[PDB]
Amino acid sequence: MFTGIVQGTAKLVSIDEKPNFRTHVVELPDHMLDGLETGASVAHNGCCLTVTEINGNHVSFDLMKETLRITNLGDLKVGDWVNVERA
Amino acid sequence: MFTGIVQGTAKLVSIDEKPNFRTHVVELPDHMLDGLETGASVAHNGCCLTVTEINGNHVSFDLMKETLRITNLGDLKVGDWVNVERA
Numbered sequence: 001m002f003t004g005i006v007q008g009t010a011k012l013v014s015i016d017e018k019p020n021f022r023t024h025v026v027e028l029p030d031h032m033l034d035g036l037e038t039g040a041s042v043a044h045n046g047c048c049l050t051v052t053e054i055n056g057n058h059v060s061f062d063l064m065k066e067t068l069r070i071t072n073l074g075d076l077k078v079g080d081w082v083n084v085e086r087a
Numbered sequence: 088m089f090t091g092i093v094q095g096t097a098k099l100v101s102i103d104e105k106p107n108f109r110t111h112v113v114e115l116p117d118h119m120l121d122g123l124e125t126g127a128s129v130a131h132n133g134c135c136l137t138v139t140e141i142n143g144n145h146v147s148f149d150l151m152k153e154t155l156r157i158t159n160l161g162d163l164k165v166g167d168w169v170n171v172e173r174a
């Protein structure tokens with residue numbers, strides 16, 4: 001799915017804690033928005049996540065508790081930069 | 088080459104700045120050491136790097152100027168945890 005050739009960084013502009021998961025909103029680079037549809041896989045810091053929503057260059061993903069515990073995505077704070085790569 | 092199923096996190100234990108490049112030494116989880124050889128590829132926060140050295144659990148990578156520029160790996164500090172996945 002992924003080459004490990006990161007295409008750029010994206011700022012975490014938002015974290016919604018909901019009852020069973022977290023939504024991360026990231027601001028993607030313009031050159032990554034082209035042809036991006038909901039359901040597409042983007043790896044965040046190497047972790048595969050599914051696009052749930054697109055508002056402009058603001059892209060949403062839903063993170064389960066297991067993803068948060070196994071990876072460092074549990075420790076991000078708003079304003080952090082994540083490596084991003086579409087598949 | 089990578090699936091984006093992160094296999095775990097690795098502590099950045101050492102950063103050795105040189106000319107141009109920068110060596111990162113990370114402490115890999117035990118279950119990732121088996122069969123790991125120099126020249127092998129591991130994605131660090133989604134960024135594919137080549138194993139340059141293995142000493143116990145301590146795995147070295149050399150990070151080139153472009154990699155530091157495109158990714159967030161330039162901002163890491165000793166003690167940070169990185170997502171890691173072997174190919």
Ligand SMILES: Cc1cc2nc3c(=O)[nH]c(=O)nc-3n(C[C@H](O)[C@H](O)[C@H](O)CO)c2cc1C
Pocket residue numbers: 041046047048049050051061062063064065066067068070071090091092093094
């Ligand atoms: C195609 C694909 C899509 C995935 N999408 C998500 C997701 O939206 N949210 C999530 O928490 N995990 C997702 N995962 C699992 C996530 O990548 C995995 O839990 C972490 O990498 C920890 O191994 C996905 C995995 C694959 C293979």
Ligand SMILES: Cc1cc2nc3c(=O)[nH]c(=O)nc-3n(C[C@H](O)[C@H](O)[C@H](O)CO)c2cc1C
Pocket residue numbers: 003004005006007128133134135136137138148149150151152153154155157158
């Ligand atoms: C098989 C493979 C091995 C790579 N090894 C390294 C490496 O050892 N050091 C490095 O700085 N970049 C390496 N890269 C490039 C690096 O992944 C890339 O510059 C960043 O992901 C930013 O796109 C490699 C790329 C591939 C595809």
